[PDB]
Task: structure prediction
Amino acid sequence: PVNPEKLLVITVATAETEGYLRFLRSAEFFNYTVRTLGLGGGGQKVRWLKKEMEKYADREDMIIMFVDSYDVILAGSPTELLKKFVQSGSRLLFSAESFCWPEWGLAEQYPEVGTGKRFLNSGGFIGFATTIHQIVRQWKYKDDDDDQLFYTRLYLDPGLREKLSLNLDHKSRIFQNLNGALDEVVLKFDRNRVRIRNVAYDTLPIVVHGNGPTKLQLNYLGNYVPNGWTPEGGCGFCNQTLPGGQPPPRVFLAVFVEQPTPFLPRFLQRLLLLDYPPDRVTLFLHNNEVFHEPHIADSWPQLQDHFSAVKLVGPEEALSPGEARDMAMDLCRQDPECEFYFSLDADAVLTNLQTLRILIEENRKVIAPMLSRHGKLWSNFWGALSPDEYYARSEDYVELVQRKRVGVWNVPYISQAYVIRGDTLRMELPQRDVFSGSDTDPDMAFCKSFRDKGIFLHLSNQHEFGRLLATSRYDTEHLHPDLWQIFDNPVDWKEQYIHENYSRALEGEGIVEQPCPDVYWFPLLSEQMCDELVAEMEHYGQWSGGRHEDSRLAGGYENVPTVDIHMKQVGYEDQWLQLLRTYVGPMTESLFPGYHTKARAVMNFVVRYRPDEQPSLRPHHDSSTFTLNVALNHKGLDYEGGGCRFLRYDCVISSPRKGWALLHPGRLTHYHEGLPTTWGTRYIMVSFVDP
Amino acid sequence: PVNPEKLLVITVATAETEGYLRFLRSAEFFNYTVRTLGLGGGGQKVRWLKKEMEKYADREDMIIMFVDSYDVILAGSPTELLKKFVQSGSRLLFSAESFCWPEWGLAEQYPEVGTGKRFLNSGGFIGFATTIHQIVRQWKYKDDDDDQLFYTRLYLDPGLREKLSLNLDHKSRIFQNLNGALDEVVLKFDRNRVRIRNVAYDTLPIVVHGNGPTKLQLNYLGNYVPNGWTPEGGCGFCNQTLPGGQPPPRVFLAVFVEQPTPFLPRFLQRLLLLDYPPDRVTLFLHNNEVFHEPHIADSWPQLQDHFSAVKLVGPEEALSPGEARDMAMDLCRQDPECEFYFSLDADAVLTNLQTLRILIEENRKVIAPMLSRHGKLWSNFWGALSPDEYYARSEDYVELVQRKRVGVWNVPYISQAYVIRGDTLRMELPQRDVFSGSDTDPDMAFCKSFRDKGIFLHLSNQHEFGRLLATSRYDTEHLHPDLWQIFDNPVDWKEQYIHENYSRALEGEGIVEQPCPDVYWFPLLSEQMCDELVAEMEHYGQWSGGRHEDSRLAGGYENVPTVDIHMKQVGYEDQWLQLLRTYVGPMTESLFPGYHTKARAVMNFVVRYRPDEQPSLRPHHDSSTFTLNVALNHKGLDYEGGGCRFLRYDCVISSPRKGWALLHPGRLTHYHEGLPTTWGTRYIMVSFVDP
Ligand SMILES: *[C@@H]1O[C@H](CO)[C@@H](O[C@@H]2O[C@H](CO)[C@@H](O)[C@H](O)[C@H]2NC(C)=O)[C@H](O)[C@H]1NC(C)=O
Ligand SMILES: *[C@@H]1O[C@H](CO)[C@@H](O[C@@H]2O[C@H](CO)[C@@H](O)[C@H](O)[C@H]2NC(C)=O)[C@H](O)[C@H]1NC(C)=O
Ligand SMILES: *[C@@H]1O[C@H](CO)[C@@H](O)[C@H](O)[C@H]1NC(C)=O
Ligand SMILES: *[C@@H]1O[C@H](CO)[C@@H](O)[C@H](O)[C@H]1NC(C)=O
Ligand SMILES: O=C(O)CCC(=O)C(=O)O
Ligand SMILES: O=C(O)CCC(=O)C(=O)O
Ligand SMILES: [Fe+2]
Ligand SMILES: [Fe+2]
Ligand SMILES: [Fe+2]
Ligand SMILES: [Fe+2]
Ligand SMILES: [Mn+2]
Ligand SMILES: [Mn+2]
Result:
């Protein structure tokens, strides 16, 4: 029964990087004691350990485990570790891996291992101070000379190995080197801790070692082991702060519009609503497209008053996206006042107005909120890569996007929205060629630039932050290209083009009215939706005239005509039909219990009533089960005329409403007539549903 | 200027027949004076005129016109007649015709007439008494010797003709013999008198003579000339009577059913409603068909109590129609109490209950009321014949059937309904072989039997009397063959099978009700219509069961079924569709202004609700614009259950009505449900119109 207090973990680390702190946090979890050597190739490792071991030269009572710091996390307790080391019958136990290195010619000299790791790895070992001192004291070589060779040549001595009883950890009982065993390692879960199991040897290693190229694989494991994320306690390091009286850090806001993006006017307006003192935020905005110049210009006088200072970079600059992200990020670096940098792409839709706070309270170096393309799996981060630096899907990927497991995660790639510490920009990565420099995509060059400096790229799915717009095929050849975004961005299209109280009226609560017997009146369209549909209609500018036939029933003749434009003529039928299924259909089935509509409508047109031409519509029936009648402009302001009238009930809709729609049975019992418009112009949208 | 008072018309007539009285009525019209000789072949004519002329032997001041009586009517005034006779420069003027008779060998001796009638006719002449006496006194021959030869041989004497200045009326200036000139004669009209014009010679004859076979042609003319019927004064001989306190003449009513006839039960019932003292009427009824035995037997206990005496002759007698019309008519002849005989066929529908009075006040020998197959020209009389005794159309035929000209008319043929004087049966036609005797059709043999005795067959269109049923193709292979009579007899089918107050409700006056919002309730079917449709339904006895699909809409499935029988199954769809167009269609267009229905209905079925099987009908919509729902039995007497319910309006038709029908919109807004029937059986007729 060896005392866990006679054990010492030693490691070498020249600075307190993210990995060294990750290692110390796991060593503090199991109550280890770690001696950090040199907080001030590779052969300088042995030289430091050599001097440190002279203190403990004659300490037969002491066990000493030396491990790497950056590429290492711990997964077991010192008690269990000593149990396995004593169980090994070895005075000094080295780690074992799959590859002979450096000299591969020495592979023949190594003893024969039946079905296990056969070669040595000097990244981690454990032994008695006396036995370890006897070895490290043979060092007399230069700092640049390889240490892996020093131990390799000493272990490979059959007599020297026999004398000091030196063995390798062939079956990864204590040391698990990841390089060469990536398929041998899986996660073992518990209530409040996580481990790794070696499915090859059915062992639970204590030390996890991401040697060689398996760095991002260790970052993945390091999100759980030992108490990264637990099935019961959740994440154990996240916040789950700012001084009350004092102000928050000064932020540099950078907005990027590198392609034509939907609902852009809505995004700049959204920038005035972030719950952060605007006197503390400088705005930088790069617009790459002349398509968006009108939108920036509309909102720019407001941003200039809101924020502390603003600066625009326009399309006349001929700035490539990478050069602008250099300039934006480098503008913050050269200002010591810039305490935080925040890059936010136009396709990012932030529905959480405290996003900037949440990410700054998180006290990380570089961090990003999780945004997901609504109803899909595509998000602004990657869980894994390929050997080609192309997207792959990691084991816990779908788990995170669906928020089954939440926390702050070490991931290989982040995009669109992130917050970067000001000091980290100027201290650990002072270069300007962060995005530009090589043919690799700027956003990929970005994450690569931070990985190559050993900086964790964190991702927080601790809360709901926002979503990502689909800009993949945004047709800009319309007067209002957003009016066709009903399929690509259903959520955003609904917020901007559907009446706010539509939802509330649909879920009961008595908003819907019934002015005539079986005529129902509810809010449907928004005032922006009506203004843009009217404008797009008149922009086509080819209204029906004489010799125009319609699907109306008066007497026995369908001769009843109208100054209209059908959706087919402007190529908007597909979109309007989806509005019927998504929005009108549910309403009709609510108002007429027992009826089921698939929203079949072949006749969809927009009507125009002017005192010069067809100011009224004579009484007719409809070639439809039910008919939808949406008014598109204000009565008394855009026109001074009557509305609709149902003769069989002697009931008149005196004043229509700008966004409200009428719903009546068409084929019978509701003989309707359109009252004359006397001044101005009256617009309505008509749909003969269920013919 | 010859005095019209020195003129004498002489004629020979052995009895006051219908023709002699017709002749005297025209002679009294123009204020002629006529001496009737012998009120007590043909040579006895001259013998009588010879003796009469000896009185006036030396009367040079006197003009004497001799004419036939039976085949003659007058058309001019004695003043105008004498004008033309004086204008002739002839002492004795004979009539002229187209045929030489008797001896045709004498045709060569007759003088040559350029373009006119060349031969003599002793049926009418005018001359001086002295000149006429000199001729008639040469008679010494027998009564049987032909008189036409006596004058022919005397006129043909060139010297004798020269001496006495004898001429013929070649151009029909005075005498118009009809035989041979039928196309030369047309009617000339005036305000209060009618004449004839000879289009061959452009003359207006005074005397009209129906010699030879042109007897019915004279009967036709004799209906107008001189004051038979005038465009202003109308008929001048009709009634246009019975003692108040005293009783009317005893009548013998004979009803004939020689073929299966529609609406027979309705006709026997109608016999109890004739406005004639039933204590004065004996009923004879011959039923030739066993098909009608149930109908006679149903009504017979009522007839026996109503009428004075009744007698039936049934199909077990094997009586041919002619033999029964002999027996019936001959039964009255052998009873002197029978003052009038009245034969009435089953196809005759008398809508005027005073028909027997009207025809007896008319004081004719044999007379008939004008009945017409509704909406057609076929009626129970003929205006003319063919040389074959087959139907032809006379000049005034359509005029009479359409009642442009009205009166009592001398026609060649009457059928179905007529009234015959009792004395005429026993006196002028005592024979029994009136209908039977020869292969000619009994009704044709009948009129022929009265024509050959010189009896006028009168016809009265002075009022509206009735109509004639179409028995031509009466399918008797049904439980109630009359239910299929909607096309053949529309008027009668409506009286018996359409609710009495349907018409009144359709012409406003607020009978129709509206128990739920757009559900209208009106009377449609009669209680006899419902009882017979129900009975015919259950008589088919093959109701829908399991695996039965219907055209109802509940949720998204048309699985809603019913214990029904469609009209197609019993072969009644054609008939029910006509009811929809004729009766339902007009009502729907009245209740829903602006709607136009051609009564399109593909689904027409009768429903049955029993407590053992499908007592209710779950909520469904309809595959129809509007739906017709007629209840067919009494609630509370034939069943004790609920009716219809409209869920969207929370309105319930608690109690349906036996003949009333419901009308609601089907496709929407009226989710309906059939309430459970708890006792008995509930029947409804459903029609999904306008799908
Ligand atoms: C949606 O409903 C809300 C609340 O019912 C409406 O808010 C009101 O707006 C009117 C002006 O339109 C004000 O006079 C009231 O004081 C508001 N009431 C509340 C409780 O805020 C809102 O206007 C409706 N939406 C639209 C487009 O009219
Ligand atoms: C058709 O309408 C008449 C008059 O509105 C109905 O006649 C009445 O009949 C009820 C019994 O059903 C009597 O109580 C009333 O006294 C009658 N009124 C008159 C003015 O005669 C007649 O019943 C209706 N037809 C049917 C089949 O009900
Ligand atoms: C570490 O030591 C403290 C006592 O100082 C003890 O309370 C805690 O439970 C220990 N943690 C572990 C994981 O052993
Ligand atoms: C016949 O004579 C009477 C006088 O007796 C006269 O009133 C009547 O008008 C005459 N009728 C005709 C048709 O001449
Ligand atoms: O509101 C109106 O103008 C009448 C609506 C109508 O019934 C039609 O479109 O024909
Ligand atoms: O009156 C009834 O029984 C219900 C009528 C109806 O809606 C149906 O036939 O389905
Ligand atoms: Fe149109
Ligand atoms: Fe309409
Ligand atoms: Fe059916
Ligand atoms: Fe129905
Ligand atoms: Mn390492
Ligand atoms: Mn004659």
